[PDB]
């Protein structure tokens, strides 16, 4: 159909735009850290690991857009396992690195003396190793279980759940929901709320006005990060919940467009984390000013 073709090329353009923005932003962040910032602080190791997870997560976007465009998986079962695995694993590492940066800022402000011991670059490397090893506890079952099954004349990259398949599918979707949206948003919200409650006493800048302006800037950063996480990861999780529990048509062009918009928003979180964690980072801005002057 002409309108189906128009919707398909619109969704492909959205996926390509999100992929291009996320890949470009993450490689700029990673290149800037590696060449200029050199990972001499816990926060920079966290930003590098977040950028790496986001650059790997958005790397599956051409594969998913091609899957949508040809209405089949033309890449085989080994690239099926590689893509769907990079996808699950790097969603988990990206979200866990986001959560751990919120925890790191909470330790920095609300436990400042203990933060002198806990926020060291060596401990940040160790924690990032735990983040990237803990997500292997789901990514390696995602590798083992990813298969290409023929469906209605076309190959679909899917997960071969053990019997009963529907039970372990709903279980996997509810545990990805809890451990990638619910528990991370609770930790991020609690950590940043306690951090902002402690920052309402911290004499940040001499003079009342400039002090409130620095506190407002930090509060605005917190609200933009939390709201970005919620509006980028909540639509895909709510859509998965609706797709599993409610009997929608599942082939409606509006439904498919909404599905891919939610997926593109979930990758837009990875595309926006470079801005939120490097363009808004004060040390990165100081480095940018210093090297541009």
């Amino acid at each position: 159909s002409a309108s189906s073709l128009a919707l398909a090329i619109a969704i492909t353009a959205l996926y390509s735009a999100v992929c291009a923005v996320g890949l470009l932003g993450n490689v700029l962040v990673m290149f800037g850290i590696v060449r200029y910032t050199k990972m001499k602080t816990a926060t920079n190791i966290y930003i590098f690991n977040l950028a790496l997870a986001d650059a790997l997560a958005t790397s599956t976007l051409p594969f998913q857009s091609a899957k949508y465009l040809m209405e089949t998986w033309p890449f085989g079962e080994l690239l099926c396992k590689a893509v769907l695995s990079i996808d699950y694993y790097n969603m988990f590492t990206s979200i866990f690195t986001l959560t751990m940066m919120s925890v790191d800022r909470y330790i920095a402000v609300c436990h400042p003396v203990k933060a002198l011991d806990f926020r060291t670059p060596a401990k940040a490397k160790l924690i990032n190793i735990c983040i990237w090893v803990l997500a292997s506890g789901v990514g390696v079952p995602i590798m083992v279980m990813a298969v290409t099954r023929p469906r209605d004349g076309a190959v679909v990259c899917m997960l071969q759940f053990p019997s009963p398949s529907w039970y372990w599918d709903t279980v996997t979707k509810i545990c990805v929901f809890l451990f990638a949206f619910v528990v991370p948003i609770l930790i991020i919200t609690v950590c940043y709320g306690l951090m902002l409650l402690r920052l309402r006493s911290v004499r940040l800048l001499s003079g009342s006005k400039e002090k409130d302006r620095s506190l407002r800037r930090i509060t605005r950063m917190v609200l933009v990060v939390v709201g970005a996480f919620v509006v980028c990861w909540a639509p895909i999780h709510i859509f998965v919940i609706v797709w599993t529990l409610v009997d929608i048509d599942r082939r409606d062009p509006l439904v498919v467009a909404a599905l891919h918009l939610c997926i593109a928003l979930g990758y837009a979180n990875s595309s926006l984390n470079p801005v939120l964690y490097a363009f808004l980072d004060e040390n990165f801005k100081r480095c940018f000013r210093q090297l541009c002057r």
Binding site: T60, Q64, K67, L84, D87, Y88, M91, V156, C157, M158, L159, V176, A180, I236, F239, V240, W243, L259, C262, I263, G266, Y267
Partner: peptide, 5 residues
Amino acid sequence: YXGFX
């Protein structure tokens, strides 16, 4: 996420 159902 969500791309493979």
